[PDB]
Amino acid sequence: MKVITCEIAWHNKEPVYSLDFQHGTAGRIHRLASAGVDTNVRIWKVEKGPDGKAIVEFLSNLARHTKAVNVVRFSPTGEILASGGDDAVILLWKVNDAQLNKENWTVVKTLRGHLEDVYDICWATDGNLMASASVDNTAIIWDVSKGQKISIFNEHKSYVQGVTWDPLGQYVATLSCDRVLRVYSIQKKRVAFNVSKMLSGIGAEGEARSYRMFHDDSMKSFFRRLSFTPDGSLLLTPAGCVESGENVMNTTYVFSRKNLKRPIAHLPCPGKATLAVRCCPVYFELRPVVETGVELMSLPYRLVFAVASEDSVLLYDTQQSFPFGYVSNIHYHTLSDISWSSDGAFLAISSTDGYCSFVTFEKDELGIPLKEKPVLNMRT
Amino acid sequence: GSCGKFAPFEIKEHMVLAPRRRTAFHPDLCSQLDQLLQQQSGEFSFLKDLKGRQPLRSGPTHVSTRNADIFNSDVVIVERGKGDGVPERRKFGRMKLLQFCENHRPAYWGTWNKKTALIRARDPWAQDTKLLDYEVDSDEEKVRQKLKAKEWDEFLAKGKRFRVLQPVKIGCVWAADRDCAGDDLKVLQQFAACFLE
Amino acid sequence: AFDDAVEERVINEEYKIWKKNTPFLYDLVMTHALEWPSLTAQWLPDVTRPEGKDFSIHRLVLGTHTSDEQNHLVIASVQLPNDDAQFDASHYDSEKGEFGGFGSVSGKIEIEIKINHEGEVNRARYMPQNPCIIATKTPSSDVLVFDYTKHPSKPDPSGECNPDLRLRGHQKEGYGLSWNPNLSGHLLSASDDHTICLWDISAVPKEGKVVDAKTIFTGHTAVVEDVSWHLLHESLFGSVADDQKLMIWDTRSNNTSKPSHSVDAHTAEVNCLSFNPYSEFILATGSADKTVALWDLRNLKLKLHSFESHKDEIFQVQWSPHNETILASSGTDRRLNVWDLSKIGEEQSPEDAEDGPPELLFIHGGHTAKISDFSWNPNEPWVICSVSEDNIMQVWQMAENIYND
């Protein structure tokens, strides 16, 4: 793998809060979108050079947002660009066929109904339903085609700093600042699972030791961006705390579909707290297996993902216990978001210092892709 | 300017040619010279005029090509640390280079501030004892950071406590790899997952 | 007998003490031992200044003098530190109290082009209008002309040279050779045949290989030791011969046997001459008198001055290109004397007059044999390259506090 840190500020040296690749791309060159405090959403063209170093070409600037833009997400088909910010309105952009722009984008829908800043957005697999988390203690589901609000979850007691949508279309997961993880049934439209506390083994002298799983306001990141696994089997939630002895350690919790009220395991991250989790959309063939009960889940394939903390990025896969990659100390301030490219050749990392970086992988470095992507057992 | 069957001289990318003339062109000069060549009048004494004016000199050859030397600096130097308090370099003069073919000891590249009154340019072999022992010399043989624009901005934000980042990347290390370094394997084992049953 | 042993011992002691005293008198000293002795030495006008480097690269034209081997015309490279890099606070030796240390900084001397040459290279000189064209004087009657771009960088596997031009005007070998700095292609040569030959190679066809003499001058009655064009006049040129005579010739004069001017310059053989670059009227001639005579072209009956600090014959005299009052002279006394004109006839303290005349500025005694030939660097002031008989080439520069002060 290679690391290319960009020495030129994309958003006038203002913090960059979000990143997302155009998932609809099927070739070798990719489209990337960045949101910043400069009230702009910038779309760039990313491709590898002859040597293998990533190169960024500026394509367009979208300045319709009035305040800082906190989240940018592409629809699964890559056709609709969702952008949310401090103005409590989510803009849906599309390519329409403004001097600085090589290509032009225009707003199709202005999703309204939030009262404060929008921090995270998650699309559904079909692309017709959207979910967003905001400062106003509510997570709102949206009819993308209708362009209207369909459901509001106000069970939160603080800011909602992350939302993920089940690829099997059964659950929607929200991570809030009240140290509480909530899982809502997509059909019942109510709270299905509530996960805040964790029993700490056996307490000393027979005590019932229970501690809060997630971090308090000391979190330096606005975001607690958890994510589902592309197959749906696992749910990865950052900003977690584990009390090994008398000290607390930052970690990312891993939950299974079988039971969502207790994690299978936790990936420990000594140092800073983990804030983002993003999965590679490519299913990989299993490595030559040294037979052990190490795998997080036992399926014929495996999935590579990345966990971004305040100052580091850890690169895990499904079957190994330890991460196969680690990068750190490439940015002078807290990281904000991570996004994989469609082919898995790129991992874009954004940080609040104003500069972004890329982690590039050469041909088949992450693994051997499956001949056919497995069919999903969607619930609906 | 091809002379005969020879191609003209090719000036390379970073070449400089010493000037062919050392005086501005005077048109009548040659004609006057011819007159002064025939007259043979002992009126003019050149050595007399030499002491009555300044000697005609010229400097080292410099580059004068159009758009020749144009550069950009993307770095600002920030110096931190007391250092050893070494004296001012300016008062030590030019660094002399003394290298000899027959010397096993490498070339000398350094200043020389020893002072004598007997080692003159008029007499190279003039000895100066009691200051230089005349025996064979070759018997046998804090921080100055160069910040970039991003690091300069971060330094202005933080101050002298700021230090440049040292990126730490660990390559792809798998459980199946056999020749992979064990140090990277243990550093990644520091992040090994912990399971709850 | 004892002569050789005593001379060797004295010369070795003198060289040892000179090397010991070198840091006080020089700012640059580069001693290099060549494969074979060089009878000629000339700085090329090229200086390559690689961007992002602390040094420049100069080039030298040299010859070889092999008793029974294959002779080569050599073009060599010398690395010299840039002026901006000569002030460097790298290390501070707390013991010697200097910003010194031997370190790893060293001047690089390497051979770039070797071309075959039949016989010894008596003198090699490049054409100013085209430094690719180099004329060489052989121990034969013919003068050779090479273009080092038209020859392989390494010598031929065997056999003699393939000269680009062969000029046949003389009957014997010679040592005086000079191009015309105002007329491209005009070459003057002097030989033991008591004559001077002028060639014009500016009209040679592409396939031409032999050029006959355009003009022959027969004024001298002895071995014509040296000839040199005037630096500003396309017609006048001077010559010095073994008949103690210096002759000023005009190419417009039809009498090819009587010079336009004749002067009894010296009391013995006159071996070299050179025109001052800054004065059209002044020139200098080195003789066997152990003297250098200064001549004004407006008054040829009177010798302007005599430099008399040499201890033996003088074979080369060249002016400094960066200072009109600075002159240099080398000879068989293993010394290179540097003279200042602006100090002629100055009052001198009793012990300073012990060293020599006031006009004497510097003495280079780092050579243990006869200085075959030296040359001033046209790009770096006060840098002189001198090659001697014991295959020793020295590129040096005297200390700054000697000339600037």
Side-chain angles (χ1 to χ4, degrees), chain A residues 233-234 258 264 286 292-302 318-319:
Chain A
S233 53
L234 296 183
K258 275 70 181 175
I264 310 177
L286 291 185
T292 320
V294 157
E295 308 116 330
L296 292 184
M297 47 92 80
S298 62
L299 274 196
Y301 52 78
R302 67 190 182 97
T318 288
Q319 46 178 187

Side-chain angles (χ1 to χ4, degrees), chain A residues 1 7 13 262 264-266 268 270 287 294 302 314 320-324 326-329 331-333 365, chain B residues 148 150-151 153-154 162 165-176 188-189 191-197:
Chain A
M1 46 176 287
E7 273 184 10
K13 296 186 177 179
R262 175 183 66 103
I264 310 177
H266 67 84
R287 227 80 196 185
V294 157
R302 67 190 182 97
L314 287 150
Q320 282 197 182
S321 68
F322 64 101
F324 71 94
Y326 176 81
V327 178
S328 85
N329 301 337
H331 290 299
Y332 295 99
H333 288 289
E365 185 173 5
Chain B
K148 326 198 77 67
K150 157 188 210 173
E151 310 173 344
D153 295 335
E154 204 62 38
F162 155 85
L165 264 185
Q166 298 180 13
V168 178
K169 175 201 107 192
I170 287 176
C172 286
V173 166
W174 301 101
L188 292 173
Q189 282 296 335
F191 303 87
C194 307
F195 297 83
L196 310 155
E197 42 183 340

Side-chain angles (χ1 to χ4, degrees), chain C residues 149-260:
Chain C
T149 67
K150 292 174 104 164
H151 287 165
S153 309
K154 291 205 175 228
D156 258 331
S158 98
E160 60 178 36
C161 46
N162 174 42
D164 298 292
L165 281 184
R166 200 178 303 263
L167 323 164
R168 45 186 205 124
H170 307 249
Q171 315 276 13
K172 268 217 175 181
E173 75 162 2
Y175 287 85
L177 189 65
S178 99
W179 292 102
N180 192 335
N182 302 273
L183 287 178
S184 183
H186 285 50
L187 182 62
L188 276 177
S189 174
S191 166
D192 299 16
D193 68 332
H194 304 235
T195 72
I196 309 164
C197 282
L198 161 73
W199 292 278
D200 184 20
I201 69 168
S202 65
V204 178
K206 190 60 178 180
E207 69 276 10
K209 292 193 139 174
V210 163
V211 174
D212 298 308
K214 166 165 175 283
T215 307
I216 301 187
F217 312 100
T218 51
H220 279 309
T221 65
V223 169
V224 193
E225 281 283 351
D226 202 0
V227 63
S228 177
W229 279 99
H230 189 257
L231 298 174
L232 279 172
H233 211 273
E234 45 175 323
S235 309
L236 313 176
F237 70 88
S239 62
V240 289
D242 276 345
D243 60 353
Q244 318 175 4
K245 269 201 184 252
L246 155 64
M247 296 177 176
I248 307 301
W249 302 80
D250 198 323
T251 62
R252 303 165 294 195
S253 174
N254 305 332
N255 198 333
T256 64
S257 63
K258 295 183 181 182
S260 190

Side-chain angles (χ1 to χ4, degrees), chain A residues 165-199 201-203:
Chain A
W165 197 289
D166 183 33
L168 308 184
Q170 190 177 356
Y171 297 108
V172 164
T174 78
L175 207 48
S176 178
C177 201
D178 50 12
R179 319 171 83 176
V180 171
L181 166 61
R182 304 188 173 74
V183 182
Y184 298 81
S185 182
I186 202 63
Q187 187 206 17
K188 280 296 182 179
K189 289 306 188 317
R190 273 100 177 98
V191 202
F193 299 100
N194 215 283
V195 181
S196 54
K197 291 225 216 291
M198 160 92 77
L199 60 87
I202 304 193

Side-chain angles (χ1 to χ4, degrees), chain A residues 155-199 201-204 206 208-242 245 247-341:
Chain A
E155 289 78 21
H156 313 100
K157 308 180 181 181
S158 282
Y159 325 110
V160 202
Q161 315 170 356
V163 158
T164 202
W165 197 289
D166 183 33
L168 308 184
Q170 190 177 356
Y171 297 108
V172 164
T174 78
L175 207 48
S176 178
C177 201
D178 50 12
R179 319 171 83 176
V180 171
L181 166 61
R182 304 188 173 74
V183 182
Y184 298 81
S185 182
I186 202 63
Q187 187 206 17
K188 280 296 182 179
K189 289 306 188 317
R190 273 100 177 98
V191 202
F193 299 100
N194 215 283
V195 181
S196 54
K197 291 225 216 291
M198 160 92 77
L199 60 87
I202 304 193
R209 202 166 64 205
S210 62
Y211 57 64
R212 307 193 178 271
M213 288 193 181
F214 301 92
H215 221 191
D216 49 333
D217 312 313
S218 299
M219 195 82 179
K220 295 181 182 300
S221 181
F222 288 155
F223 318 100
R224 294 175 193 262
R225 295 185 159 116
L226 46 76
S227 184
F228 266 129
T229 304
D231 59 29
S233 53
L234 296 183
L235 177 56
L236 314 172
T237 70
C241 301
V242 161
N247 226 16
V248 287
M249 185 171 52
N250 301 130
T251 194
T252 308
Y253 284 105
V254 181
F255 299 81
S256 176
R257 291 192 68 91
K258 275 70 181 175
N259 84 90
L260 283 169
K261 286 168 163 178
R262 175 183 66 103
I264 310 177
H266 67 84
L267 320 177
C269 177
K272 310 282 190 175
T274 61
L275 59 101
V277 168
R278 209 64 186 274
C279 304
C280 188
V282 186
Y283 298 86
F284 292 102
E285 210 93 45
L286 291 185
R287 227 80 196 185
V289 286
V290 74
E291 297 93 353
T292 320
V294 157
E295 308 116 330
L296 292 184
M297 47 92 80
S298 62
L299 274 196
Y301 52 78
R302 67 190 182 97
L303 286 186
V304 170
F305 65 93
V307 175
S309 75
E310 291 182 0
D311 62 344
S312 40
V313 169
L314 287 150
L315 288 169
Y316 302 87
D317 74 341
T318 288
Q319 46 178 187
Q320 282 197 182
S321 68
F322 64 101
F324 71 94
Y326 176 81
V327 178
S328 85
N329 301 337
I330 61 180
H331 290 299
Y332 295 99
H333 288 289
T334 307
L335 311 173
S336 50
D337 202 13
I338 44 176
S339 178
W340 288 87
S341 64

